């Protein structure tokens, strides 16, 4: 297998809130937003990093059933999903701009082994790390 | 924002099991395996994509409390977590090799507007799409 990861799924509570969060506050660009059938294909990514898209996926019908949407939303809002790590050239500077936009932080920037690290949440409660190596 | 996604988290039920799956069935390489306090930080990734790592994160104590652990493990076993999309040159060929390696596919390969897509599950029950660019 010669594979690459083109898309990462982010489970969201509400696709309009998440589109606004990801574009307005984080400063990602819209890659797709089209509704095919009963489903909105909404994807975003960082400026000039075209080859990974983040899929903003609704946690609710039809894709998810009653008992699963309930339990899964509840976990999302608790911050159980850590989506991954975003590498940036400067964690402290990126932190200041995100703060200014009203992003909340799980962890403020902190010195670590080989760079500065912070942890923010998205509109749904999902976590991302910021690291600058 | 100027950022690159360097790591993606995959929640797993058992890290040894996940390691074996990701390396022995998908052929990813181990990128890190070490312990940071109580937690095992275990990462894997495609041999040709050295700049992204998939973090195989134990759903269990101490990161997650017992109620959370129970609710989360249940939803993972049900296939609630779609990790993302792995792009390959030919989904049908890759489908055949993975099926022969013992990988479960909940969807066989299907032609789509972008190309051909299949869907498999990992050893925890998480799902991935396998996509190519073939009309």
UniProtKB/TrEMBL annotation, chain A:
Residues 4-133 form the VOC domain. InterPro entries: Glyas_Bleomycin-R_OHBP_Dase, Glyas_Fos-R_dOase_dom, Glyoxalase_1_CS, VOC_core. The gene is ucmS2. Gene3D superfamilies: 2,3-Dihydroxybiphenyl 1,2-Dioxygenase, domain 1. CDD domains: VOC_like. Keywords: Dioxygenase, Metal-binding, Oxidoreductase. GO terms for molecular function: dioxygenase activity; lactoylglutathione lyase activity; metal ion binding. This is Glyoxalase.
């Amino acid at each position: 297998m010669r594979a690459r990861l083109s898309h990462v799924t982010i489970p969201v509570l509400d696709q309009d809130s998440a589109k606004a969060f990801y574009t307005e506050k984080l400063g990602f660009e819209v890659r797709n937003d089209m509704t095919i059938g009963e489903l909105r294909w909404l994807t975003v990514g960082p400026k000039d990093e075209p080859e990974v898209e983040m899929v903003l996926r609704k946690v609710g019908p039809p894709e998810y059933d009653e008992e699963t949407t309930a339990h899964f939303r509840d976990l999302i809002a608790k911050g159980v999903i850590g989506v991954g790590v975003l590498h940036v050239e400067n964690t402290r500077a990126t932190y200041e701009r995100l703060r200014q936009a009203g992003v909340t932080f799980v962890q403020e920037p902190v010195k670590r082994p080989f760079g500065t690290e912070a942890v923010f949440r998205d509109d749904s409660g999902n976590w991302f790390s910021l690291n600058d190596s």
